[PDB]
C-alpha cells in the first residue's frame, strides 16, 4: 500500500524520462495566405488549402 523506503532523485528522474513533450514536427504554410497552420487544420484567418472557408 505504501513505501518502506524513500525512492531517490535518481529513480524519480528515470520514471520521468518518458514525460518529455513532443514538439510539433513541422507547420504547414498556406498556398494563398502564406500563414503557418497545423496540417489539416484551418488558419487563424480562416483559410484552408488556399480557400477562405470561414465567415470571419
Amino acid at each position: 500500500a505504501v513505501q518502506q523506503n524513500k525512492p531517490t532523485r535518481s529513480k524519480r528522474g528515470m520514471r520521468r524520462s518518458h514525460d518529455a513533450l513532443t514538439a510539433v514536427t513541422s507547420l504547414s504554410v498556406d498556398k494563398t495566405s502564406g500563414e503557418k497552420h497545423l496540417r489539416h487544420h484551418i488558419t487563424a484567418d480562416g483559410y484552408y488549402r488556399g480557400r477562405k472557408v470561414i465567415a470571419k
Partner: protein, 120 residues
C-alpha cells in the same frame, strides 16, 4: 469488445444522444455552419445526411418522417423547400468537416461542420 460496431457512445445514454443529435441537426440545417467537437461532427454526418436524402422526394409521408426525426416544422420546411432542390443532383456528401484547433476550456479538438454549398 467493439469488433465491427458502429456509433460512438459519447459518454451519454441513448436518450440524451438522440436528443442532442436532434438539436444539433436542427442547428446545422438552420445555420449551415456550426462549430462543435470533431467526433460529434463525425456522428452529425450520419444524423444529418440521411435527413437531407429524405428531403429529396417531397411527399406528406416524407414530411412526417422528417418531423418525427427532427421535431421542428421550420427545419422540415427548410429541408424540403431549399436543401432538397439544392442537393437534388448530388449523390451523398452533403456536408464537410474542417478541423479548427482546440477548445480553450478543456483542450477538446474542434471542427466546423458545413453544408457543401452554403454561400454565406
Amino acid at each position: 469488445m467493439r469488433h465491427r460496431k458502429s456509433g460512438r457512445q459519447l459518454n451519454r445514454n441513448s436518450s440524451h444522444r438522440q436528443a442532442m443529435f436532434r438539436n444539433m441537426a436542427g442547428s446545422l440545417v438552420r445555420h449551415e455552419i456550426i462549430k462543435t467537437t470533431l467526433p460529434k461532427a463525425k456522428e452529425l454526418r450520419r444524423v444529418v445526411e440521411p435527413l437531407i436524402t429524405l428531403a429529396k422526394t417531397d411527399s406528406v409521408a416524407n414530411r412526417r418522417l422528417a418531423f418525427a426525426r427532427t421535431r421542428d416544422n421550420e427545419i422540415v420546411a427548410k429541408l424540403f423547400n431549399e436543401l432538397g432542390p439544392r442537393f437534388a443532383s448530388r449523390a451523398g456528401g452533403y456536408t464537410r468537416i474542417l478541423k479548427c484547433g482546440f477548445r480553450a476550456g478543456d483542450n477538446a479538438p474542434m471542427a466546423y461542420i458545413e453544408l457543401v454549398d452554403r454561400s454565406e
